[PDB]
């Protein structure tokens, strides 16, 4: 009997004032939250933000919407959401969000006989996440999502995670290319501004960066060029054109690699680990070039001393490079 | 009782003309402003602007909205803001702005018994900031936000910072990697256009650029290449291949640095400090190469003169480079 359902729904929305919260003038209305994380698409060091898609569900109670004589949950057309009171929930650290609207607005309204309202949205949000890149690419980050009421203070509304630590689902399915999600945490607290105290829910993830891409992409070319630079020490000192060609080629390749690396990061004012390694390699190749320049300078009158310098450089450079690598990989791991 | 408040608000909005400002036809209405800065996402020299996110709060008194019998302040659902008069405040130097709208429009309306309205918005605006880059990267910028009334002249409306020096908070939340905030300033004034005089608030920040990255990545390579270019003065002039290789390498490396580094800024017509420094280093290395060319040209008929020229160049070039550096760093610091 759809006519009785229609009459009941018309009666529920008769004289209903959406300007007033449930239990207006009385105790705060409690709103429970749930989130299903569909995906975490892109994490950007350049923009210091991440994108996240989720199903966001709010549960509350509105005694003006209690009905009797119909033993069913009432799933209503989402446009009814424009005729009801809903919480003014927002995300504090977001930069650009939207609700999906194909084929219709991705919104759900479900009434229960006792007056309980379930209100669901599907949201894609970009959110700010400040990152500490001092140990990049061996770094670990903590990215949060902050959920707050905008207009209502703690005297009007209260938030709580519905189900405790089970209120956020789908985190274990997330696969990220550059990161892995070590842990996620849920917090509830109060925040005081000049206009009063407001409820706050926090959902935080800890991300650890995978190292394999940087081993394959930047560390190996630098190591291989540095090793290539040592072949000069095994060439006779009278082949001036070859060894000068080696020095020039190695310096040019170092500059090209450095530019291609730095063209992908923000202009931070401190030294990163990869910067330290690359300038170590540059120092090594420059020292090899200067050593050859010295040997070529003094070899005309003292060939034996030049040969001795080359022979000792055959040994010293690998040893010092191994020591530098040991120190670097012990300071960062 | 919810029905009593419902009928009170219905009486308040009955006969309310939204087309008329408070005290229309009488004394001007005073609007107090507050700004809570959440972040400055980015500052772009290429686009000559910066992105700011803030809570913008406006305070005024509308006697038509006064109510009695309820000793409470009514925090209303923000949709009621579509039925009230609000100031036509705009930002003159903004280029693209939006109010955040997830999960609902980030808007707040609070009424007080005597008729005071508090109206809050969460706004992200990209505002223009014309930059003088003559001292770049040692430059200091001043970026402003201009708040004005569009339609109402000084006869209709007045603006003032509510709280004086404390009207803007959250300045310590501004975290820019490439800048630091030195000072912020609040200004109130009037601006005359051909349609009349309008109130104007101004919020300005002074940004100081951090020099560490440019010291690390630009100045040191030029200094090191100039010093390497000085090694030719200490080499005997019979080593034509070695000295020619040194000069060519220094010249080409300077050109490569300039081409691969300067191509990253707006096409300003004037010369920046870093441009003048790089051109000075290029001039020095080119003059060293030209000096060697002349010495090689003349040394077969006047060896003593060539030796004297090299001996004096050894002393003169470092001295003039030190003088150039002293003048540059005194002028720009």
């Amino acid at each position, epitope marked *: 009997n759809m006519s009785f359902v229609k009459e009941t729904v018309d009666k529920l929305l008769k004289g209903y004032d959406i300007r007033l919260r449930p239990d207006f003038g009385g105790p705060p209305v409690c709103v429970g939250m749930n989130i299903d994380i569909a995906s975490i698409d892109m994490v950007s060091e350049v923009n210091m933000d991440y994108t996240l898609t989720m199903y966001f569900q709010q549960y509350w109670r509105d005694k003006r919407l209690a009905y009797s004589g119909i033993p069913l949950n009432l799933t209503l057309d989402n446009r009814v959401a424009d005729q009801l009171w809903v919480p003014d929930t927002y995300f*504090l*650290n977001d930069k650009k969000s939207f609700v999906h609207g194909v084929t219709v607005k991705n919104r759900m309204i479900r009434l229960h006989p006792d007056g309980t309202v379930l209100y669901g949205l599907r949201i894609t949000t970009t959110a700010a996440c*400040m990152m*500490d890149l001092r140990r990049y690419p061996l770094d670990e980050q*903590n990215c*949060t999502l*902050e959920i707050e009421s905008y207009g209502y203070t703690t005297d009007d509304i209260e938030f709580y995670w519905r189900g405790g630590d089970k209120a956020v689902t789908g985190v274990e399915r997330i696969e990220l290319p550059q990161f892995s999600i070590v842990e996620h945490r849920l917090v509830s607290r*109060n*925040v*005081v*501004f*000049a206009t009063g*105290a407001y409820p706050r829910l926090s959902l935080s993830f800890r991300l650890k960066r995978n190292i394999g891409y940087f081993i394959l992409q930047t560390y190996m070319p630098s190591i291989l060029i540095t090793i290539l630079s040592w072949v000069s020490f095994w060439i006779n000192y009278d082949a001036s054109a070859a060894r000068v060609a080696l020095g020039i080629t190695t310096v040019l390749t170092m500059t090209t690699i450095n530019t291609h690396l730095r063209e992908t990061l923000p202009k931070i004012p401190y030294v990163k680990a990869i910067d330290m390694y690359l300038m170590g390699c540059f120092v090594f190749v420059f020292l090899a070039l200067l050593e050859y320049a010295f040997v070529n300078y003094i070899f005309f009158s003292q060939p034996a001393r030049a040969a001795a310098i080359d022979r000792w450089s055959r040994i010293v450079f690998p040893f010092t490079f191994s020591l530098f690598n040991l120190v670097y990989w012990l300071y960062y791991v | 009782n919810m029905s009593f408040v419902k009928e009170t608000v219905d009486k308040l909005l009955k006969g309310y003309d939204i087309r008329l400002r408070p005290d229309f036809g009488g004394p001007p209405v005073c609007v107090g402003m507050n700004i809570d800065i959440a972040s400055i996402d980015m500052v772009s020299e290429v686009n000559m602007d910066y992105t700011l996110t803030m809570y913008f709060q406006q305070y005024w008194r509308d006697k038509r909205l006064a109510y009695s019998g309820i000793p409470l302040n009514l925090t209303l659902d923000n949709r009621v803001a579509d039925q009230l008069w609000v100031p036509d405040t705009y930002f003159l130097n903004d280029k693209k702005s939006f109010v955040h709208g997830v999960t609902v429009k980030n808007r707040m309306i609070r009424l007080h018994p005597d008729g005071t309205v508090l109206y809050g918005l969460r706004i992200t605006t990209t505002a223009a900031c014309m930059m003088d880059l003559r001292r770049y990267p040692l430059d200091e910028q001043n970026c402003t936000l201009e708040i004005e009334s569009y339609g109402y002249t000084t006869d209709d409306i007045e603006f003032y910072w509510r709280g004086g020096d404390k009207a803007v*908070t959250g*300045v*310590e939340r*501004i*975290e820019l990697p490439q800048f*630091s*905030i030195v000072e912020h300033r609040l200004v109130s004034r009037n601006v005359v256009f051909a349609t009349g005089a309008y109130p104007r608030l101004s919020l300005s920040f002074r940004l100081k650029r951090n020099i560490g990255y440019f010291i690390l990545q630009t100045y040191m390579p030029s200094i090191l290449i100039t010093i390497l270019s000085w090694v030719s003065f200490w080499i005997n002039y019979d080593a034509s291949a070695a000295r020619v290789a040194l000069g060519i390498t220094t010249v080409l490396t300077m050109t490569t640095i300039n081409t691969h580094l300067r191509e990253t800024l707006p096409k300003i017509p004037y010369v920046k400090a870093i441009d003048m420094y790089l051109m000075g280093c290029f001039v020095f290395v080119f003059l060293a190469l030209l000096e060697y060319a002349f010495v090689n040209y003349i040394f077969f008929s006047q060896p003593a003169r060539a030796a004297a020229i090299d001996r004096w160049s050894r002393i003169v070039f470092p001295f003039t480079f030190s003088l150039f550096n002293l003048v540059y760093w005194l002028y720009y610091v």
Partner: nanobody, 105 residues
Framework: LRLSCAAS????????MGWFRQAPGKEREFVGA????????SYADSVKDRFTISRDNAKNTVYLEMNNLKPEDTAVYYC??????????????????WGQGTQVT
């Protein structure tokens, strides 16, 4: 007189340090706040131009220098850390990690 607050651990997640003082009969009172990186200080009215706050990241320390003391500056002093999205700068509820109380007469 000079008070030093040295912080260790995850100082990146708590980029703001604040100073408070508790009187024997009054509640906790905000004194000043300092940003670890930006070095942008903020002060309460009662200690403007008299107290100064400085930060050094070398050993992660913040210094409160107190000058021109008064008998109304006899309170137990605390240092605290504030989260990145913790709200207003003047409210003790918004500060998570509190140091040990220090007495000044």
């Amino acid at each position: 007189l000079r008070l030093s607050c040295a912080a260790s651990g995850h100082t990146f997640n708590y980029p703001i340090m604040g100073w408070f003082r508790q009187a024997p009969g009054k509640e906790r009172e905000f004194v000043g706040a300092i940003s670890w990186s930006g070095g942008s200080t903020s002060y309460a009215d009662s200690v403007k131009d008299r107290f100064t706050i400085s930060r050094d990241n070398a050993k992660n320390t913040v210094y409160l220098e107190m000058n021109n003391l008064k008998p109304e500056d006899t309170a137990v002093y605390y240092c605290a850390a504030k989260g990145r999205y913790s709200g207003g700068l003047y409210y003790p509820t918004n500060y998570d990690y509190w140091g040990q109380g220090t007495q000044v007469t």
